[PDB]
Amino acid sequence: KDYQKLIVYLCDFLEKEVQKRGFKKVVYGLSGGLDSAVVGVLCQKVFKENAHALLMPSSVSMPENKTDALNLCEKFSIPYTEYSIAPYDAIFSSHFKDASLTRKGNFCARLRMAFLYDYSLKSDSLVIGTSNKSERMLGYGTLFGDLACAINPIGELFKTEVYELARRLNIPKKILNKPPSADLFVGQSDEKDLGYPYSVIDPLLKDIEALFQTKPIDTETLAQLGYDEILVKNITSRIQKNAFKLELPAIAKRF
């Protein structure tokens, strides 16, 4: 129950990493969801007015999410800026009508990466990421999109742990009770895309991280732990298919 210890640890991390790089200001995307709310509150405790939230709704971003984001900023005195990327996704939709929801969402996530980095350069700030360990392991995120940042304080925290941390940070119940959703298209949700809730995925991901962090996953070993055959096959496939997102691009060694 020593989450106060964890909060101090993460705040110290943010302070040290930003300082060692020669910066004193940070920016991050605030979506109205749990993860970015946690990152926003942590940065506010460390940089106060020097931590800035950037809200970037799209043409399909759900309205409620944005208002919840604004309410968070007012509650925690977080300076913010609202910048719509709708004019950009509108062009993409007109040029690629039959584009899959995934392609449309990935473009938006990258547009967000671009404006966060643009904002950072013009204001001399660093971009703080919000991807949690569950998403990172599953590769549930857009490469060079929401996975793009300079520093990420909750990258080794599983989704269930980010939630527990959020409670200690007094994150609004509105955001705490909100089901995870990339919000890249109307009706999207982590549970629907993944097929299982984080209450079922996280326990398995934790054993996989402990047993096979730098070695191949042994589905038979996981089977012995009492995990559903189908569940293991599905989660293992996702992890192995997206392992590349956690690695640097392959560069031919000097001849």
Ligand X SMILES: Nc1ncnc2c1ncn2[C@@H]1O[C@H](COP(=O)(O)OP(=O)(O)OP(=O)(O)O)[C@@H](O)[C@H]1O
Ligand Y SMILES: Nc1ncnc2c1ncn2[C@@H]1O[C@H](COP(=O)(O)OP(=O)(O)OC[C@H]2O[C@@H]([n+]3cccc(C(=O)O)c3)[C@H](O)[C@@H]2O)[C@@H](O)[C@H]1O
- Residues making up the annotated binding site are 29-36, 110, 130, 135, 159, 181
Which one of residues 24, 103, 167, 192 is an interface residue with a second copy (CB under 8 A)? Answer: 103
Tokens at residue 174, please? 């509105």
Reading the block at residue 206, the tokens are 């934790």
Contact mark string toward ligand X, 90..119, x via CB under 6 A? ----------------------x-------
Q: Which does 140 bind (CB under 5 to 8 A by kind): a second copy, Mg ion, ligand Y, none?
A: ligand Y
CA distance 183 to 62: 7
The window from 18-26, 77-85, 157-165, 176-184 that contacts Mg ion (CB under 5 A) reads 176-184
**What is the phi-psi region of residue 139: left when phi exceeds 0, alpha when psi lies from -120 to 50, beta otherwise?**
left
Q: Cα dist. 104→53, 90, 130, 244 in Å?
A: 24, 10, 21, 21
Of the candidates 61, 74, 10, the one whose C-alpha atom is nearest the C-alpha of residue 31 is 61
Q: Which residues have CB under 8 Å from 243's CB, separation 6+?
A: 139
Does 169 bind a second copy (CB under 8 A)? Our answer is no
Site string for ligand Y, 91-120 (x = CB under 6 A): -----------x--xx--x-------x--x
Residue closer to a second copy by CB (options 22, 226) is 22
Using CB under 6 A as the criterion, which residues of the chain lie in contact with ligand Y when the complex forms? 21, 102, 105-106, 109, 117, 120-121, 126-127, 135, 139-143, 145-146, 150, 182, 184, 190, 193, 244
